[PDB]
Amino acid sequence: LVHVASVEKGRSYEDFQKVYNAIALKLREDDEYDNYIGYGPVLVRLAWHISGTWDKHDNTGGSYGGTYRFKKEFNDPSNAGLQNGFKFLEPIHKEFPWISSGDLFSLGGVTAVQEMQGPKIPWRCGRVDTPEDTTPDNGRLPDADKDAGYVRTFFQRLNMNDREVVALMGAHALGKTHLKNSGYEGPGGAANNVFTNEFYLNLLNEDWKLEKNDANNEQWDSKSGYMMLPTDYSLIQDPKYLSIVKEYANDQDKFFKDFSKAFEKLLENGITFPKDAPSPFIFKTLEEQGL
Ligand code: HEM
């Protein structure tokens, strides 16, 4: 399977910066969602789940085809709760009907990270919608009740190494787990709609307790009202993972730089860009534009 990026006809940077601005403006406007967390966290989880289906062995899945719009993928039990992110983006797709679905879902993740004052994420356009029969089957996304060996093996399918996995997991500082979506409940820290390295700091400094929640699943809970998934706590149980957790807890700029590289790679896996394709765009935030 080869997937060649094809720029939406006649579009350039200025067109995609208008779409970025439309998403950022609605993120600011619809601030009441999920007890005032806002839509930022569910939009970076949507960009990760539409990319996270990729398989390096046969180049199936991934963000290219925008197949989350089809019933099979939209209804995946692992995607429970992401309908809220799709509904947020639906008015913006009506306003810019020329953007492909893969490009809009991946750009929603980029916009959310940057507007929640995370690092700049370079982004490339050119994903092309593919037919319903190219939709990957359910079951390619990760379980939360496992250990470090499972996380390591799982991310080898997306060819992410240990460093890329630990950097990507720092996004779990954002938003919260919701009992009715996943069978887990609670936030991972106090700043859950501002992008920071707090996930690493909490993992190493909190006093965690293994408890059972109302859906009968075990999770790690702390005196401060925070929680961590079994796969999250994995990162301090493994010696290789633990030393990179300590590095990001002690250097927030290195965490931002490594996250940016791994998140762009996640969103681009499976796509072939021609050498006459445009360079990655770096979008300005609303704040840098005085908007
Ligand atoms: C082994 C890897 C991972 C597992 C098992 C996992 C699992 C989960 C689960 C169970 C939730 C809660 C869903 C809900 O109840 O609403 C969640 C939320 C979230 N995850 Fe992951 N995740 C993984 C990796 C990642 C990565 C790599 C990213 C992003 C780069 C990410 C971003 C998020 C975000 C932002 C949320 C919060 C969503 C919200 O507030 O609505 N996750 N994760």
Same domain, 10 and 131: yes
Per the listing, tokens 């037919």 go with: 131
Q: Is 240 in the pocket of ligand 1 (CB under 6 A)?
A: no
- Integer angstrom CA distances of residue 212 from 153, 176, 185, 219: 26, 17, 10, 6
- Residue 211 is classified by DSSP as E
Q: Is 41 in the pocket of ligand 1 (CB under 6 A)?
A: yes
Query: What's the CATH number where 218 sits?
Result: 1.10.420.10
In this structure, the number of other CB atoms found within 10 A of the CB of residue 243 comes to 11
For residues 180 and 280, what is the distance between their CA atoms, to the nearest angstrom? Answer: 38
In terms of Cα–Cα distance, which of 187, 77, 45 is closest to 143? 77
Same domain, 136 and 185: no
Same domain, 129 and 154: no
Angle at 144 between CA 134 and CA 174, to 5 degrees: 90
Same domain, 4 and 129: yes
Say whether 210 sits in a helix, a strand or coil.
strand
In this structure, the number of other CB atoms found within 10 A of the CB of residue 282 comes to 12
Q: Is 192 in the pocket of ligand 1 (CB under 6 A)?
A: no
User: Is the separation of the CB atoms in 130 and 6 below 8 Å?
Assistant: no
Q: Is 49 in the pocket of ligand 1 (CB under 6 A)?
A: no
- Integer angstrom CA distances of residue 119 from 24, 45, 108, 249, 255: 15, 16, 15, 16, 9
Same domain, 202 and 58: no
What lies within 8 Å, CB to CB, of 156 at 6+ separation is: none
What separation in Å is there between the alpha carbon of 106 and the centre of ligand 1? 16
Same domain, 194 and 241: yes
Same domain, 16 and 122: yes
Pairing status of strand 208-212 against strand 218-222: antiparallel
Q: Is 151 in the pocket of ligand 1 (CB under 6 A)?
A: yes
Residue type present at position 98: W
What lies within 8 Å, CB to CB, of 154 at 6+ separation is: 142
- Residue 59 is classified by DSSP as T
**Which tokens go with 157?**
């399918």
What separation in Å is there between the alpha carbon of 141 and the centre of ligand 1? 10
**Which tokens go with 282?**
């770096």
In this structure, the number of other CB atoms found within 10 A of the CB of residue 221 comes to 20
Total domains in the fold of the chain = 2
Same domain, 148 and 257: yes
For residues 190 and 173, what is the distance between their CA atoms, to the nearest angstrom? Answer: 9
Q: Is 172 in the pocket of ligand 1 (CB under 6 A)?
A: yes
Q: Which residues are paired to 218 by β-bridges?
A: 212
For residues 139 and 280, what is the distance between their CA atoms, to the nearest angstrom? Answer: 31
Same domain, 132 and 3: yes
Residues for the chain: how many in total? 291
What separation in Å is there between the alpha carbon of 10 and the centre of ligand 1? 36
For residues 113 and 170, what is the distance between their CA atoms, to the nearest angstrom? Answer: 12
User: Is the separation of the CB atoms in 237 and 84 below 8 Å?
Assistant: no
Q: Experimental method for this entry?
A: X-ray
What separation in Å is there between the alpha carbon of 289 and the centre of ligand 1? 30
Q: Is 85 in the pocket of ligand 1 (CB under 6 A)?
A: no
What separation in Å is there between the alpha carbon of 266 and the centre of ligand 1? 14
Nearest residue (CA) to ligand 1, atom 6: 144
Same domain, 137 and 270: yes
Query: What's the CATH number where 110 sits?
Result: 1.10.520.10
DSSP per position, 100-133: -HHHHHHHHHHHHHHHTT-----B--------GG
User: Is the separation of the CB atoms in 92 and 26 below 8 Å?
Assistant: yes
Same domain, 1 and 132: yes
In terms of Cα–Cα distance, which of 226, 235, 206, 22 is closest to 108? 22
For residue 203, the enclosing domain spans 142-262
Of the chain, the end-to-end C-alpha distance in Å amounts to 42
Q: Is 176 in the pocket of ligand 1 (CB under 6 A)?
A: yes
Nearest residue (CA) to ligand 1, atom 21: 172
What lies within 8 Å, CB to CB, of 6 at 6+ separation is: 126, 128
Same domain, 2 and 125: yes
